[PDB]
Amino acid sequence: YVVFL
Amino acid sequence: YVVFL
Amino acid sequence: YVVFL
Amino acid sequence: YVVFL
Amino acid sequence: YVVFL
Amino acid sequence: YVVFL
Amino acid sequence: YVVFL
Amino acid sequence: YVVFL
Amino acid sequence: YVVFL
Amino acid sequence: YVVFL
Amino acid sequence: YVVFL
Amino acid sequence: YVVFL
């Protein structure tokens, strides 16, 4: 799981 | 913005 | 699953 | 914008 | 910002 | 688990 | 601007 | 996937 | 502008 | 994943 | 600006 | 993971 913002 | 899972 | 915005 | 799954 | 797990 | 801000 | 993934 | 703007 | 996928 | 702006 | 991961 | 600004 990865989120980049 | 990116989300991956 | 991937979302790019 | 792209979504793929 | 990034979160990965 | 990693978060960078 | 470029995004690639 | 690539977008150039 | 170009998008390819 | 890469974004250049 | 660049982000890559 | 790398960000340059």
User: Mind spelling out the 3-state secondary structure of chain E?
Assistant: CEEEC
Instruction: Report the neighbours of K using a cutoff of 3 or more CB pairs below 8 angstroms.
Output: A, J, L
Eight-class DSSP state of G4: E
Which chain E positions have a beta carbon within 8 Å of F2's beta carbon? 2-5
Determine the distance in angstroms separating the CA of K5 from the nearest CA of chain A, rounded to an integer: 9
Nearest one of F1, F4, D3 to G5, comparing CA atoms: D3
Which tokens in the block code for residue K3?
């982000």
Which chain D residue has the Cα nearest residue C3?
A: D3
Resolution number, Å: 1.9
Q: How many CB atoms lie within 10 A of CB G1?
A: 10
Widest CA span in chain J: 14
Query: How was this entry determined?
Result: X-ray
Which tokens in the block code for residue L3?
């960000």
| Residue J3: burial class (beta carbons within 10 Å; 0-12, 13-18, 19+) | buried
Task: Give the C-alpha separation, C2 to B4, whole Å.
Answer: 4
Task: Give the C-alpha separation, J5 to I5, whole Å.
Answer: 20
Query: Is G1:H5 a contact under the CB 8 Å cutoff?
Result: yes
Which chain J positions have a beta carbon within 8 Å of G4's beta carbon? 1-2
Task: Give the C-alpha separation, F3 to I2, whole Å.
Answer: 33
